[PDB]
RNA sequence: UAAGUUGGGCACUCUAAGUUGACUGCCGGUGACAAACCGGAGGAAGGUGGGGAUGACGUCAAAUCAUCAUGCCCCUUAUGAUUUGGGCUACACACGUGCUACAAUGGACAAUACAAAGGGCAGCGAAACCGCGAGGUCAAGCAAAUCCCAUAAAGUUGUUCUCAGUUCGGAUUGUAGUCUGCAACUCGACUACAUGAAGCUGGAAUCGCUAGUAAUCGUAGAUCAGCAUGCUACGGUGAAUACGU
């Protein structure tokens, strides 16, 4: 469904609508509004059929899919089938970079246990 | 004609102030007072030396100013205002100096000194 | 603008020494010719440096510091070869930083 | 040890900054200024003797 | 990253082309840091110098992902008790 | 240790105003909550028609406390009347910090509902005032033989 | 005149130098007449006018031998030395400091006004051109009241949003790119796309602050091949209360 992708909730405006497509934000689709000249208009989903269409095949334009979840898996878990300390740090929220993990535990792993071992 | 003329000084801002003979009606920059003012709706304060000094007024006004926020030099208006008028007349102290308007309040900023920063907040202490 | 004239700058960190050197100058300036500009100021440039009362801790108590420049600028109108003299012949003393100009 | 750091900053390098500019006569790296290439300490205790140019202190 | 372009540290290429051009190693040394992967140096067993003894890796062709500035790190488990 | 006056504000002209709006002010923004409440007060006269001044000073009556209690000692508590400084101050402190309790989406309604609610007698503004004075002269009998 | 840009002007602002002023000092009362308290005028500024610097005898056998200096003690084919790489930055957890959040005084888009202070010579980077962008070309002026940093932001006016884990928030991750440095893998910074976390005002306890203060917005600098939510100063808006001991 139903305008585009898949999940798009009815009687609401262009410029929000279009993002809880898994692919893309919110500039992106102010491009594809440019394309097909399409615009809200004003709280709420005005879309009649006669620009359904043309946002329904110029939205192919892009990974907009969920092959971008695909992609993103195959990225990783190529990236530590490899060799792979990035793998490594792929488990420890430390991307190839770095973040310096001491109070990093709470993006990822629910501070839950709390237990220290002081002194 | 003629005219007179008074600075005005306030709160890190200076406002020379040209006081013309006239109906009253006010261009500071060539600017009228709306269109350098947020919002404002308290230009009747800076209207306040013509309520009790030459009463009720009016004289119109040409100013050229810059330095500070508006507040500041919108109240840097009023003090070259009263000096300019009594200029005019030493009548006019008597009423001022029992409402003020005039004394170029010396108050503005303060230095920093360790216990400030990015914004101005004094430290704690360390607990437990 | 266009006109005949000599134009100095000073620089010291002293305002007496800095203004009686220039009464020397001016002096002498007009002495040997006319059209003299006074000692004509400019806003005094500061610095500062801020340290801790300290060898290993404790930054809380800090200090500072500065270096004050004064700065002083002179013209002249209708040049000559003695002004220029007036010039070159006296500055001291010498804490001074004159840089002679046209 | 400090003394053999003394020859390390001050031979040649194999590029532009390995470097690191440390006080002349102290021999602290940190707390360095350059205009006057003095470390934090050595420049108030000389400060204070009245040698440098100048007032100091005590207007802002 | 890189300002264009790739590079290597030209001690590496200058080595392993005559390790290359002919039948290649099993085993290399070196230090590898200021250098990188590119398709000449696939197959052979580089070794980056760990911090206390370099161990041999094969390169592999799918090994665009990862590179050769690092493959095991320093830190080794872990420093700490528990685990990921 | 005295007060150092606001002196008036002739939007809509009066002075309570003046010393209301300074409370609103969150962070600094005095034009914001000057916006808002000369807003309120022209809406608080579009609905239900009437007078700024009617259904503003009749409220800030209506929440105004007059008896008030202070504590010193075991557990006792002075019953004590109010300065007409802090009356006022009371009556708007207590009026927007409710006022806030409302709870709607909108800049102005809470308001004009706050005052105009006020002005008939309800609202917790008015319920502040009822339990206030509630366990203020209720127990009056034992601290009042005092300052 | 695009424009103080130039003729002319130094009136005003200003710039930095010299001096006047505020001292119970003038009046009135009170008070051992005295000290002193209270009030009145004047003045811009009245009772140390605001602030800064300044820190008594000494205390904590407080801190520093790792700024430095140094007694004693110890090392010396190494407790001294050079170099590449590495780490000082780990990660079940707690603690403290601070940032941004938990949205309608709010969020997104557009127009639009007001600063102060400080830095730039092998450094500031103007105009114009390319690029969505960080940035890139290019080169004018600039040892500075000249020119560049450098739009100040908050605000004000408008359009939309109409209470949702939302156009709230902005973590983490992948990709594509910018600069610096040789090289950004441990470990730089940065933009663009996509992701779209916890969280809907905080328990027990607890800290700051008496007016240009708190609250709050941004700016400049040092350290500096690149790198500051921190430090220092800079201003902008700007409050409530002080019954009383």
Redesign the pocket.
């Known amino acids: 469904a139903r305008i585009a992708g898949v999940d798009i909730p009815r009687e609401?405006?262009v410029?929000?609508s279009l993002?809880?497509?898994?692919?893309?934000?919110?500039?992106?689709?102010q491009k594809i509004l440019e394309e097909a000249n399409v615009s809200?208009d004003?709280?709420?989903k005005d879309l009649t059929d006669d620009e359904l269409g043309r946002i329904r095949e110029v939205v192919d334009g892009?990974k907009v899919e969920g092959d971008?979840r695909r992609?993103?898996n195959l990225?990783?878990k190529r990236?530590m089938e490899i060799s792979s300390?990035?793998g490594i740090?792929?488990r420890?929220?430390?991307?190839?970079?770095?973040?310096?993990?001491?109070?990093?535990?709470?993006?990822?792993?629910?501070?839950?246990?709390?237990?220290?071992?002081?002194k | 004609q003629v005219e007179y003329?008074?600075?005005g000084?306030?709160?890190?801002?200076?406002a020379?102030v040209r006081l013309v003979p006239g109906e009253g009606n006010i261009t500071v920059?060539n600017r009228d007072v709306r269109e350098?003012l947020?919002?404002?709706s308290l230009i009747l304060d800076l209207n306040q030396p013509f309520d009790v000094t030459e009463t009720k007024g009016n004289y119109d006004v040409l100013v050229n100013?810059?330095?500070?926020?508006?507040?500041?030099?919108a109240?840097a208006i009023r003090h070259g205002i009263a000096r300019a008028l009594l200029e005019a007349d030493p009548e006019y102290?008597?009423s001022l100096?029992?409402a003020?308007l005039?004394?170029?309040?010396?108050?503005?900023?303060?230095?920093?000194?360790?216990?400030?920063?990015?914004?101005?907040?004094?430290?704690?202490?360390?607990?437990? | 603008?266009?006109?005949q004239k000599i134009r100095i700058?000073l620089?010291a960190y002293?305002?007496?020494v800095?203004?009686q050197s220039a009464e020397k100058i001016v002096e002498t300036a007009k002495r040997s010719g006319a059209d003299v500009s006074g000692p004509?100021?400019?806003?005094?440039?500061?610095?500062?440096y801020?340290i801790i009362?300290a060898?290993?801790?404790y930054?809380?108590?800090?200090?500072?510091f500065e270096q004050?420049t004064?700065?002083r600028?002179i013209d002249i109108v209708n040049p000559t070869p003695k002004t220029v003299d007036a010039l070159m012949g006296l500055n001291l003393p010498s804490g001074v930083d004159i840089?002679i100009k046209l | 040890?400090?003394?053999?750091?003394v020859?390390?900053q001050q031979?040649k390098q194999?590029?532009?900054?390995?470097?690191?500019?440390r006080?002349e006569?102290?021999?602290?790296p940190?707390?360095?200024?350059?205009?006057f290439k003095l470390?934090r300490?050595?420049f108030r205790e000389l400060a204070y003797k009245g040698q440098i140019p100048g007032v100091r202190?005590?207007?802002? | 990253?890189?300002?264009?372009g790739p590079?290597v540290?030209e001690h590496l290429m200058k080595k392993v082309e005559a390790q290359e051009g002919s039948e290649k190693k099993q085993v290399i040394k070196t230090?590898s840091?200021?250098?990188?992967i590119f398709p000449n140096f696939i197959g052979h067993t580089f070794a980056?110098?760990?911090?206390?003894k370099h161990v041999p890796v094969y390169v592999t062709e799918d090994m665009v992902?990862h590179?050769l500035?690092?493959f095991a790190?320093?830190?080794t488990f872990?420093?700490?008790?528990?685990?990921? | 240790?005295?007060?150092?006056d606001?002196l008036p504000d002739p939007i809509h002209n009066s002075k309570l105003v003046?010393?209301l709006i300074?409370?609103?002010?969150?962070?600094?923004?005095?034009?914001?909550?000057?916006?808002?409440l000369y807003s309120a007060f022209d809406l608080v006269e579009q609905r239900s028609g009437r007078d700024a001044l009617e259904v503003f000073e009749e409220a800030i009556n209506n929440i105004m406390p007059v008896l008030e209690v202070?504590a010193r000692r075991s557990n006792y508590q002075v019953p004590?009347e109010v300065?007409p400084?802090?009356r006022?101050?009371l009556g708007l402190?207590w009026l927007?910090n409710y006022a806030?309790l409302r709870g709607e989406?909108?800049?102005?309604d809470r308001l004009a509902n706050e005052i105009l609610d006020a002005a008939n007698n309800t609202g917790g503004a008015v319920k502040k005032r009822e339990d206030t004075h509630k366990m203020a002269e209720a127990n009056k009998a034992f601290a009042h033989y005092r300052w």
């Open positions: 609401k405006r410029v929000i993002t809880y497509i898994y692919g893309i934000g919110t500039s992106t689709a809200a004003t709280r709420v892009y971008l992609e993103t990225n990783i990236l300390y990035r740090r792929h420890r929220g430390l991307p190839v970079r770095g973040q310096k993990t001491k109070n990093n535990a709470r993006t990822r792993k629910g501070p839950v246990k709390t237990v220290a071992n002081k | 003329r008074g600075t000084r306030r709160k890190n801002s200076v020379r920059n350098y947020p919002f404002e100013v810059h330095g500070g926020g508006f507040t500041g030099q109240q102290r008597g100096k029992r003020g005039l004394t170029r309040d010396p108050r503005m900023k303060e230095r920093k000194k360790p216990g400030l920063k990015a914004a101005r907040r004094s430290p704690q202490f360390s607990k437990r | 603008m266009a006109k700058r620089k002293d305002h007496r800095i203004d004509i100021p400019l806003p005094t440039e500061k610095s500062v801020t009362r060898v290993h801790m930054k809380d108590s800090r200090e500072q004050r004064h700065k600028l840089e | 040890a400090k003394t053999s750091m020859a390390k031979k194999k590029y532009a900054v390995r470097e690191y500019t006080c006569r102290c021999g602290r940190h707390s360095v200024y350059r205009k470390c300490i050595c202190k005590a207007s802002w | 990253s890189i300002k264009k590079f540290d230090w840091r200021r250098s990188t980056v110098y760990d911090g206390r992902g590179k500035g690092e790190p320093t830190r872990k420093g700490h008790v528990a685990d990921d | 240790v005295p007060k150092r606001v003046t010393k300074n409370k609103i002010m969150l962070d600094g923004k005095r034009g914001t909550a000057q916006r808002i202070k004590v300065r400084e802090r006022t101050t402190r927007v806030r989406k909108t800049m102005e």
